[PDB]
A = this chain, B = another copy of it.
Amino acid sequence: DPMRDAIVDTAVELAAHTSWEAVRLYDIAARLAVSLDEIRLYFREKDELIDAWFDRADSRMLKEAESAGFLDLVASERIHHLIMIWLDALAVQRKVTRQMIMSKLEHIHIQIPAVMRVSRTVQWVREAAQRLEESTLTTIYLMTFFFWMRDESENSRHTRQFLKRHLTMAAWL
């Protein structure tokens, strides 16, 4: 954990009012009314927080992937359903998330580690749909993601349709 999560929550609220770039651990400490030494027990760097954010999404996705309701869906609907939970999780703060990602731009240290996260995630979603070519799905997951970022529609309606279509189009072929 509840303390690790309260950090992330705090980090993320802060970024909202101001921006991500503007967020320091000094301020997280300040908001939570605790010492910077406390915070650094959990997080020694600002990056480490991004990790946590994306791991929070990955776990919402995991809870879903084992619900009895999930095994009921179709292979197609399954992939679409996981990706959406993921993006809904992140959606709790879409602008901040976007900021986090724009942030590692033009960041080899932050960039290489994401590549690997994407592959695991893509492979995991693909395996999580049992009980489509890797690139295709990757390409789709990537594009949906980047599209989702700026999708200012409610509930990301536009993203949910976009994903549905590419996944379907692709399947048929």
Contact = CB atoms under 8 A, between A and B. Distances in A.
In the complex this chain forms, how many copies of it are found? 2
Given A115-B143, A115-B166, A135 B123 contact: yes
Interface in A112-136: 112, 115-116, 118-119, 122-123, 133-136
A116 B139 CA distance: 9
A140 interface: yes
A30 interface: no
A46 interface: no
Interface string A84-104: 000000000000000000000
A165 interface: yes
Interface string A128-156: 00000111111110110001001100000
B115 A165 contact: no
Nearest to A161: B108
